[model samples]
Target: MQIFVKTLTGKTITLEVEPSDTIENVKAKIQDKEGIPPDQQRLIFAGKQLEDGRTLSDYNIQKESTLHLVLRLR
Candidate 1:
């Protein structure tokens, strides 16, 4: 599935993931592409938080769906 991730700063990144891949896997990729640490990265999709243990399919994420990425700055 294809997903579009938009940062709070307005930067956007495109990701391609399989249904079997967990959200953490996506965050791992984001760590490489977006420079945000997985622990600090907060992903919001369809108004819900994306959990590390959950697969993309679990969220029923559709192709070309958009997710919001917020970096937890503590």
Candidate 2:
């Protein structure tokens, strides 16, 4: 399956990953691909914080679903 990321300011980043992957893994991917820090990224999925310990399967993220991300600079 795949995961999609959408920024509040109008940007879409797509990621290909398994459901077992953790949020931490995706954060790292974001940093690697877009140069955005995990701490600087606020991912709001299902109107809650992106708990690191949980897997994407825990949230049951559908394919092509948009994960809201708000990135900020330090």
Candidate 3:
């Protein structure tokens, strides 16, 4: 599945993930592509927080859904 990610500073990222991949896996992808730490990354979709251990399918997060990326301070 393909997903879009947006950051607070106006950066946008496009990600392609499998339904079986965990949210943490997505975070690692983000870190590899954008240099954000997985621990500091927060992914929010449809107002719900995507937990690290959960799969994309757990959130029904396919069909080009967009995730809001918020980084933790410190």
lDDT of 3 by residue, 1-74 (tens): 78989998888889988989999999999999989899998899989988999998899997688899997777
Name the regions of candidate 2 deviating beyond 4 angstroms: 72-74
Q: Could you estimate the TM-score for every candidate?
A: 0.91, 0.87, 0.91
Please provide, for model 1 over 1-74, each residue's C-alpha lDDT reduced to its tens digit, 9 standing for 90 to 100.
78989987888999988889898999999999967799999899988988999998899988898889987766
lDDT of each: 0.89, 0.83, 0.91
- Over 4 Å off, model 1: none
The superposed Cα distance between candidate 3 and the true structure at residue 50, in angstroms, equals 1.3
Task: Write down the worst ten-residue block by lDDT for model 2.
Answer: 65-74
Candidate with the larger TM-score of 1 and 2: 1
**What does the lDDT read for residue 31 in candidate 1?**
92
* RMSD of each predicted structure: 1.1, 1.6, 1.1
The weakest ten consecutive residues by lDDT in model 3 span 63-72
Instruction: Kindly report which residue pairs in candidate 2 clash with one another.
Output: none
Clashing residue pairs in candidate 3 (N, C-alpha, C atoms within 3 angstroms): none
Question: Candidates ranked by TM-score, best first?
Answer: 3, 1, 2
